[PDB]
Protein backbone atom coordinates (compact mmCIF):
# COMPACT_ATOMS: atom_id res chain seq x y z
CA UNK A 1 0.00 0.00 0.00
CA UNK A 2 2.98 2.37 0.21
CA UNK A 3 5.52 3.21 -2.47
CA UNK A 4 8.82 1.45 -1.76
CA UNK A 5 11.25 4.11 -0.47
CA UNK A 6 14.26 1.81 0.09
CA UNK A 7 16.49 3.26 -2.60
CA UNK A 8 19.98 4.75 -2.44
CA UNK A 9 18.46 8.21 -2.96
CA UNK A 10 15.08 9.87 -2.55
CA UNK A 11 15.46 11.43 -5.99
CA UNK A 12 15.99 14.52 -8.10
CA UNK A 13 14.07 17.79 -7.50
CA UNK A 14 14.04 20.28 -10.33
CA UNK A 15 12.87 23.81 -9.59
CA UNK A 16 12.16 26.17 -12.47
CA UNK A 17 12.17 29.74 -11.21
CA UNK A 18 10.81 32.04 -13.92
CA UNK A 19 10.95 35.65 -12.78
CA UNK A 20 11.78 37.78 -15.80
CA UNK A 21 9.90 37.65 -19.13
CA UNK A 22 10.41 39.02 -22.64
CA UNK A 23 8.27 42.15 -22.99
CA UNK A 24 6.59 40.73 -26.12
CA UNK A 25 4.89 38.11 -23.97
CA UNK A 26 2.99 40.88 -22.17
CA UNK A 27 4.01 39.31 -18.85
CA UNK A 28 5.45 41.27 -15.93
CA UNK A 29 8.22 40.57 -13.41
CA UNK A 30 7.21 37.99 -10.81
CA UNK A 31 8.40 39.70 -7.64
CA UNK A 32 8.23 37.25 -4.75
CA UNK A 33 9.29 34.18 -6.77
CA UNK A 34 12.89 34.18 -5.44
CA UNK A 35 11.34 33.80 -1.98
CA UNK A 36 9.46 30.75 -3.27
CA UNK A 37 12.51 29.21 -4.88
CA UNK A 38 14.59 29.73 -1.73
CA UNK A 39 12.00 28.22 0.58
CA UNK A 40 11.50 25.33 -1.84
CA UNK A 41 15.12 24.33 -2.28
CA UNK A 42 15.78 24.41 1.48
CA UNK A 43 12.62 22.48 2.15
CA UNK A 44 13.11 19.82 -0.55
CA UNK A 45 16.85 19.52 0.29
CA UNK A 46 15.89 18.78 3.87
CA UNK A 47 13.48 16.05 2.70
CA UNK A 48 16.43 14.28 1.01
CA UNK A 49 16.10 15.38 -2.63
CA UNK A 50 19.02 16.32 -4.86
CA UNK A 51 17.75 19.81 -5.63
CA UNK A 52 18.57 21.87 -8.71
CA UNK A 53 17.41 25.46 -9.30
CA UNK A 54 17.03 26.87 -12.85
CA UNK A 55 16.23 30.56 -13.43
CA UNK A 56 14.42 32.47 -16.21
CA UNK A 57 14.16 29.56 -18.61
CA UNK A 58 12.97 29.78 -22.18
CA UNK A 59 10.31 27.38 -23.42
CA UNK A 60 12.91 25.27 -25.26
CA UNK A 61 15.10 25.36 -22.14
CA UNK A 62 12.21 24.05 -20.02
CA UNK A 63 11.39 21.26 -22.49
CA UNK A 64 14.99 20.18 -23.01
CA UNK A 65 15.99 20.21 -19.36
CA UNK A 66 12.94 18.09 -18.48
CA UNK A 67 13.56 15.82 -21.49
CA UNK A 68 17.17 15.32 -20.41
CA UNK A 69 16.18 14.71 -16.80
CA UNK A 70 13.78 11.97 -18.01
CA UNK A 71 16.68 10.33 -19.89
CA UNK A 72 18.86 10.01 -16.80
CA UNK A 73 19.09 6.77 -14.87
CA UNK A 74 16.69 6.91 -11.91
CA UNK A 75 17.17 3.22 -11.02
CA UNK A 76 18.54 4.15 -7.61
CA UNK A 77 15.99 6.93 -6.87
CA UNK A 78 12.65 6.43 -5.03
CA UNK A 79 10.85 9.23 -6.90
CA UNK A 80 11.05 12.41 -8.96
CA UNK A 81 9.85 15.92 -8.16
CA UNK A 82 9.51 19.06 -10.26
CA UNK A 83 8.30 22.52 -9.24
CA UNK A 84 7.27 25.14 -11.75
CA UNK A 85 7.15 28.82 -10.77
CA UNK A 86 5.85 31.09 -13.54
CA UNK A 87 3.01 32.84 -15.32
CA UNK A 88 0.48 30.50 -16.89
CA UNK A 89 -2.99 30.21 -18.43
CA UNK A 90 -5.18 27.14 -18.77
CA UNK A 91 -3.08 24.01 -19.46
CA UNK A 92 -0.12 26.19 -20.29
CA UNK A 93 2.94 27.69 -18.55
CA UNK A 94 5.20 30.58 -19.57
CA UNK A 95 8.85 30.46 -20.36
CA UNK A 96 10.51 33.86 -20.67
CA UNK A 97 9.90 33.11 -24.34
CA UNK A 98 6.16 32.39 -24.60
CA UNK A 99 3.95 29.51 -23.51
CA UNK A 100 4.37 25.73 -23.61
CA UNK A 101 1.76 23.10 -22.64
CA UNK A 102 2.07 21.53 -19.20
CA UNK A 103 1.15 18.16 -20.71
CA UNK A 104 4.28 18.24 -22.94
CA UNK A 105 6.59 19.08 -20.02
CA UNK A 106 5.31 16.16 -17.95
CA UNK A 107 4.89 13.63 -20.78
CA UNK A 108 8.68 13.05 -20.86
CA UNK A 109 8.17 11.07 -17.65
CA UNK A 110 5.39 8.74 -18.88
CA UNK A 111 5.92 5.06 -18.07
CA UNK A 112 6.90 4.27 -21.64
CA UNK A 113 9.32 7.22 -22.00
CA UNK A 114 11.16 6.96 -18.71
CA UNK A 115 11.44 3.33 -17.68
CA UNK A 116 13.62 3.94 -14.63
CA UNK A 117 10.83 5.96 -12.94
CA UNK A 118 8.28 3.24 -13.70
CA UNK A 119 6.08 2.47 -10.63
CA UNK A 120 7.64 5.44 -8.92
CA UNK A 121 5.73 8.63 -8.04
CA UNK A 122 6.37 11.53 -10.41
CA UNK A 123 5.46 14.78 -8.63
CA UNK A 124 4.75 18.19 -10.17
CA UNK A 125 4.07 21.28 -8.10
CA UNK A 126 2.79 24.18 -10.16
CA UNK A 127 2.62 27.79 -9.06
CA UNK A 128 0.96 29.64 -11.94
CA UNK A 129 -2.36 31.13 -13.00
CA UNK A 130 -4.73 28.83 -14.86
CA UNK A 131 -6.97 31.55 -16.29
CA UNK A 132 -8.42 34.92 -15.26
CA UNK A 133 -11.36 34.08 -12.99
CA UNK A 134 -11.47 35.39 -9.44
CA UNK A 135 -12.87 33.62 -6.41
CA UNK A 136 -14.80 36.17 -4.33
CA UNK A 137 -15.36 33.68 -1.52
CA UNK A 138 -18.29 33.45 0.90
CA UNK A 139 -19.46 33.58 4.56
CA UNK B 1 -0.99 40.75 -3.79
CA UNK B 2 -0.24 40.10 -7.46
CA UNK B 3 -1.57 37.43 -9.82
CA UNK B 4 0.31 34.75 -11.69
Amino acid sequence: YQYNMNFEKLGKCIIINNKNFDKVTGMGVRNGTDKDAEALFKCFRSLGFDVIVYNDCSCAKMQDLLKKASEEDHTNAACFACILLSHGEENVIYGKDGVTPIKDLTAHFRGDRCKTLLEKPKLFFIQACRGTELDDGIQ
Amino acid sequence: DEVX
Binding site: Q2, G32, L40, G111, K122, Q127, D136, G137 | X4
Partner: protein, 93 residues
Protein backbone atom coordinates in the same frame (compact mmCIF):
# COMPACT_ATOMS: atom_id res chain seq x y z
CA UNK C 1 2.53 -7.41 -16.23
CA UNK C 2 1.72 -3.94 -17.67
CA UNK C 3 1.35 -0.50 -16.12
CA UNK C 4 -0.46 2.45 -17.69
CA UNK C 5 1.91 5.08 -19.09
CA UNK C 6 -0.02 7.81 -17.27
CA UNK C 7 0.07 6.09 -13.87
CA UNK C 8 1.96 7.37 -10.81
CA UNK C 9 1.80 11.09 -11.59
CA UNK C 10 0.64 13.67 -9.08
CA UNK C 11 0.04 17.34 -9.91
CA UNK C 12 -0.24 19.82 -7.09
CA UNK C 13 -1.56 22.99 -8.72
CA UNK C 14 -1.67 26.21 -6.70
CA UNK C 15 -5.16 26.90 -8.03
CA UNK C 16 -8.19 25.42 -9.81
CA UNK C 17 -8.60 25.51 -13.61
CA UNK C 18 -9.78 28.84 -15.01
CA UNK C 19 -8.64 30.84 -11.98
CA UNK C 20 -5.78 33.11 -10.87
CA UNK C 21 -3.11 32.40 -8.31
CA UNK C 22 -1.68 34.94 -5.85
CA UNK C 23 1.94 35.96 -5.27
CA UNK C 24 3.12 38.43 -2.62
CA UNK C 25 6.19 40.55 -3.62
CA UNK C 26 7.84 40.57 -0.22
CA UNK C 27 6.86 37.08 0.85
CA UNK C 28 6.28 34.69 -2.01
CA UNK C 29 3.18 32.97 -3.27
CA UNK C 30 0.33 31.68 -1.07
CA UNK C 31 0.59 28.11 -2.27
CA UNK C 32 4.38 27.71 -2.18
CA UNK C 33 4.81 29.30 1.24
CA UNK C 34 1.95 27.23 2.63
CA UNK C 35 3.39 24.06 1.08
CA UNK C 36 6.89 24.64 2.48
CA UNK C 37 5.58 25.46 5.91
CA UNK C 38 3.55 22.23 6.11
CA UNK C 39 6.40 20.17 4.63
CA UNK C 40 8.84 21.76 7.12
CA UNK C 41 6.46 20.56 9.85
CA UNK C 42 5.15 17.25 8.53
CA UNK C 43 7.18 16.30 5.49
CA UNK C 44 8.55 13.20 7.18
CA UNK C 45 5.49 11.86 9.05
CA UNK C 46 2.41 12.56 6.85
CA UNK C 47 1.28 10.89 3.60
CA UNK C 48 1.48 13.25 0.61
CA UNK C 49 -2.34 13.68 0.22
CA UNK C 50 -2.63 14.55 3.92
CA UNK C 51 0.11 17.12 3.38
CA UNK C 52 -1.57 18.59 0.30
CA UNK C 53 -5.03 18.55 1.87
CA UNK C 54 -3.64 20.65 4.72
CA UNK C 55 -2.06 22.94 2.17
CA UNK C 56 -5.51 23.21 0.60
CA UNK C 57 -6.97 24.26 3.95
CA UNK C 58 -4.21 26.73 4.81
CA UNK C 59 -4.47 28.56 1.49
CA UNK C 60 -8.29 28.49 1.66
CA UNK C 61 -8.50 29.85 5.22
CA UNK C 62 -5.38 31.85 6.09
CA UNK C 63 -5.32 34.00 2.99
CA UNK C 64 -7.44 36.80 1.56
CA UNK C 65 -6.22 39.13 -1.19
CA UNK C 66 -5.21 42.71 -0.54
CA UNK C 67 -4.96 45.03 -3.50
CA UNK C 68 -5.54 48.77 -3.72
CA UNK C 69 -7.11 47.99 -7.08
CA UNK C 70 -10.66 47.11 -5.90
CA UNK C 71 -11.08 44.42 -8.60
CA UNK C 72 -8.48 42.03 -7.06
CA UNK C 73 -9.45 42.98 -3.47
CA UNK C 74 -10.64 40.48 -0.77
CA UNK C 75 -10.36 37.46 -3.11
CA UNK C 76 -9.79 33.80 -2.25
CA UNK C 77 -7.84 30.83 -3.61
CA UNK C 78 -8.21 27.07 -3.47
CA UNK C 79 -5.44 24.76 -4.79
CA UNK C 80 -6.04 21.65 -6.84
CA UNK C 81 -4.48 18.20 -6.42
CA UNK C 82 -4.59 15.76 -9.33
CA UNK C 83 -3.56 12.24 -8.34
CA UNK C 84 -2.83 9.22 -10.52
CA UNK C 85 -0.78 7.65 -7.73
CA UNK C 86 -1.34 3.98 -7.09
CA UNK C 87 0.09 3.90 -3.54
CA UNK C 88 0.46 6.01 -0.43
CA UNK C 89 3.55 8.22 -0.51
CA UNK C 90 5.67 8.87 2.59
CA UNK C 91 8.99 10.70 2.19
CA UNK C 92 10.83 8.52 4.74
CA UNK C 93 12.28 5.04 5.58
Amino acid sequence: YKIPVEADFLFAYSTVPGYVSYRVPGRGSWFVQALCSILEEHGKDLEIMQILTRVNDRVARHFESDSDDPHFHEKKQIPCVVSMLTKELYFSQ
